[model samples]
Target: MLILKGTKTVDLSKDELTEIIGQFDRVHIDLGTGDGRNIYKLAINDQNTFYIGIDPVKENLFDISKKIIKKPSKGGLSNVVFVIAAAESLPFELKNIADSISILFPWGTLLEYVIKPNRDILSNVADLAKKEAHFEFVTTYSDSYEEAEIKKRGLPLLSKAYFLSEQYKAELSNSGFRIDDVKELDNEYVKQFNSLWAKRLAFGRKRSFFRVSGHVSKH
Candidate 1:
């Protein structure tokens, strides 16, 4: 699997990758991790868990990857890695590796896969997790709505599908995740989490949002 740090990309063998993550008690994979703020924070705070942030857009990853490349004296840690890949085409080296998965404020195709039924994205995500692995999703209502609404709100319109909470829960359940919790979140909730897109919606005209959490089913 290819891992990125600044401008450099390294091909890590599965054994090498295993050696890196094996020491950690848990592994967390953050899908569509825009800017990687959440993983960076978690990796810095939790030394016992390993973190991987995945995003297909290389530009969105450069800054954080560069930060990770710096020496620990400069605030870098070995517990975190970044992968350049889409949700549907995750590297095989990651199979059954994640103990927890997080999809935060996903837009574009990532959001579409969760909203639209029958896409293989969720299944691919499930494949990367250990049995009964936890999964969490947080998305804003406006982004899930039509592209016009997203553009009107000055946000990038990624997909055409408008998704509701119930629809999302049903789709996730069908994709091997047992829905455990779902709820609409407010501006205060967004502020507490500090996601850029979530904050934009919370502070902007559209404040509606929803988060879902569950575990992979044995089926």
Candidate 2:
């Protein structure tokens, strides 16, 4: 496994991976974790739950990765790890390891894959989860793009964005997840949820956010 810490990348051996996994009862995998603040916060608060943050971009990981090297007395977390990997190309060693997975505020190709319902992306996500593992996805649709640009990209207009909830449900259902809940987060909901992106979007002109969560289907 390619484990990254600041500017360095190390190939973690199977023995190392086993030692890490043995320490926790559950593992939370965060895909496209930008900066990794979310997982870092969770890891510190929930020491029993190991957290792994994965992103293809190395630069976005440097800050948090450096902190992981610090001593716990100096505010580092032993339960947190950063991995250099893309959503679709996750390391095989991670298969069936996650107890829960989150894709929060995904952008670029990761966003496109979810919106476009790419099979490989969806299947890879399912493959990473242990049976009955939970999956959560939160995406924001603010007026960051012009209507012309949105339409050109085949993305829904801001006003009708929530209408895509059913489509997302269908896509997730087909990808081995049983839809448990779907929420269209309004401004008030965004404030309550406390997502950095959601908060930023709320301060902007107009924004819409949605959260979808479920568990991997038994069948």
**Root-mean-square deviation per candidate:** 4.4, 2.7
TM-score versus the correct structure, for each prediction? 0.85, 0.87
Compared to the true structure, candidate 1 yields what TM-score? 0.85
**In model 1, which residue pairs have backbone atoms overlapping below 3 Å?**
none
Model 2 per-residue lDDT tens digits across residues 1-219: 898865799898767877998989999999988787777778888999999888888887787788878889977788988888998788888888889988887775687666556766788888888999998887764344543555688865433344346876677678777778767776665554344654675666656776778897733
Off by over 4 Å in 1: 142-170
Instruction: Report backbone clashes per prediction.
Output: 0, 0
* True-structure RMSD for candidate 2: 2.7
